[PDB]
Design a protein around this nucleic acid. Structure first.
Ligand SMILES: [Cl-]
Ligand SMILES: [Cl-]
Ligand SMILES: [Cl-]
Ligand SMILES: [Cl-]
Ligand SMILES: [Cl-]
Ligand SMILES: [Cl-]
Ligand SMILES: [Mn+2]
Ligand SMILES: [Mn+2]
Ligand SMILES: [Mn+2]
Ligand SMILES: [Mn+2]
Ligand SMILES: [Mn+2]
Ligand SMILES: [Mn+2]
Ligand code: NA
Ligand code: NA
Ligand code: NA
Ligand code: NA
Ligand code: NA
Ligand code: NA
Ligand code: NA
Ligand code: NA
Ligand code: NA
Length: 333
DNA sequence: GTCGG
DNA sequence: GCTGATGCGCA
DNA sequence: CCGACGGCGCATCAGC
């Protein structure tokens, strides 16, 4: 059904192998870039030559594409798939808090499976233990209807703490997706601007409230502006429990809301491409500001921004609505 | 790994 | 304490 | 051993 589905799944697999096993992050990013441009390509790829025309596809992927098209597989990937060490390493990184270095360490110590990992809980830090505890639940996606209930709860409780907070659910949700990986909330409040923090514990108060009402159930990491943890909807009387979910909360200066909401709306790929296009135009964008780079590549003063579109205009891109910042694929008959 | 020098 | 490096996470 | 590739928050360590 997915047009060029075979190719893009191959490149995604290779990407995960480079990131997770090889610890080669640039090759990860190359394979990701290549799989992104191919999936958005509206034609059937017939040869490596044709793929090579696209930006991000060079000689080695085209070569891989030629092989895949001829044989229906890739020998490199078949060998990786056979390697139990490479497989277990790859698998352990799916646990939140376990990245490529801790996975490799664990596998070399004989920790190869989910069952093994539970038995070695005392090797795990808190982040990892919570990721393990909820590993099955965090695999599941969240239907938009549950996203709306999660929204209702978050916005009710923020308003209880202080009616001047504004919470905005970003991520896939803001891009209109029918299901989401997790819930990403952007928080602002007038006391926190880029120039001053006139109130203390602005993020901590909201988090405390969300735990007090037993929405937030666990914490992975927590600072002054970013919270990362776990939440769960209330189940009704006698109906089964809802799964636990990942929730991110990011407090952003009130005067930089637009760079903020652009960042937290994503997608990640869109952001990396948008920020890459800024660089070639002579700007640098982060979640706070868009700045010009001087002759030496040092950023200068923030430019004024009164809307998301102002950011796109500075870098000569047509505005793209949030729905159009998601990745997309094409189909065949 | 791909691109821009 | 500061800084800066590594590891992990976010979009 | 051509070097850039988006950019940053939190956690933890090392060297000063
Ligand atoms: Cl690399
Ligand atoms: Cl294969
Ligand atoms: Cl894009
Ligand atoms: Cl900044
Ligand atoms: Cl997407
Ligand atoms: Cl890179
Ligand atoms: Mn489809
Ligand atoms: Mn397309
Ligand atoms: Mn998300
Ligand atoms: Mn998230
Ligand atoms: Mn303008
Ligand atoms: Mn994500
Ligand atoms: Na197909
Ligand atoms: Na190319
Ligand atoms: Na992980
Ligand atoms: Na509501
Ligand atoms: Na903490
Ligand atoms: Na659960
Ligand atoms: Na561009
Ligand atoms: Na204005
Ligand atoms: Na990066």
């Amino acid at each position: 059904e997915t047009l060029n589905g075979g190719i893009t799944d191959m490149l995604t697999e290779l990407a995960n192998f480079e990131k997770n096993v090889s610890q080669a992050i640039h090759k990860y990013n190359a394979y990701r870039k290549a799989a992104s441009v191919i999936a958005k390509y509206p034609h059937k790829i017939k040869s490596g030559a044709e793929a090579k025309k696209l930006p991000g596809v060079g000689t080695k992927i085209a070569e891989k594409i030629d092989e895949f098209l001829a044989t229906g597989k890739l020998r490199k990937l078949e060998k990786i798939r056979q390697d139990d060490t490479s497989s277990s390493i790859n698998f352990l990184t799916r646990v939140s808090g376990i990245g490529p270095s801790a996975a490799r360490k664990f596998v070399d110590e004989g920790i190869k499976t989910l069952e093994d990992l539970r038995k070695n809980e005392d090797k795990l830090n808190h982040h990892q233990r919570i990721g393990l505890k909820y590993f099955g639940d965090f695999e599941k996606r969240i239907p938009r209807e549950e996203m709306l209930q999660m929204q209702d709860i978050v916005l009710n409780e923020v308003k209880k703490v202080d009616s001047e907070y504004i919470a905005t659910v970003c991520g896939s949700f803001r891009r209109g997706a029918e299901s989401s990986g997790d819930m990403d909330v952007l928080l602002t409040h007038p006391s926190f601007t880029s120039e001053s923090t006139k109130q203390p514990k602005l993020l901590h108060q909201v988090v405390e409230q969300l735990q007090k009402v037993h929405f937030i159930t666990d914490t992975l990491s927590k600072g002054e502006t970013k919270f990362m943890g776990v939440c769960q909807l209330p189940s009704k009387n006698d109906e089964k429990e809802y799964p636990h979910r990942r929730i991110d909360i990011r407090l952003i200066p009130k005067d930089q809301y637009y760079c903020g909401v652009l960042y937290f709306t994503g997608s990640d790929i869109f952001n990396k491409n948008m920020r890459a296009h800024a660089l070639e135009k002579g700007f640098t964008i982060n979640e706070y500001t868009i700045r010009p780079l001087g002759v030496t590549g040092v950023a200068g003063e923030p430019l004024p921004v009164d809307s998301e579109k102002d950011i796109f205009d500075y870098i000569q891109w047509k505005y793209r609505e949030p729905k159009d910042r998601s990745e997309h694929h094409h189909h065949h008959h």
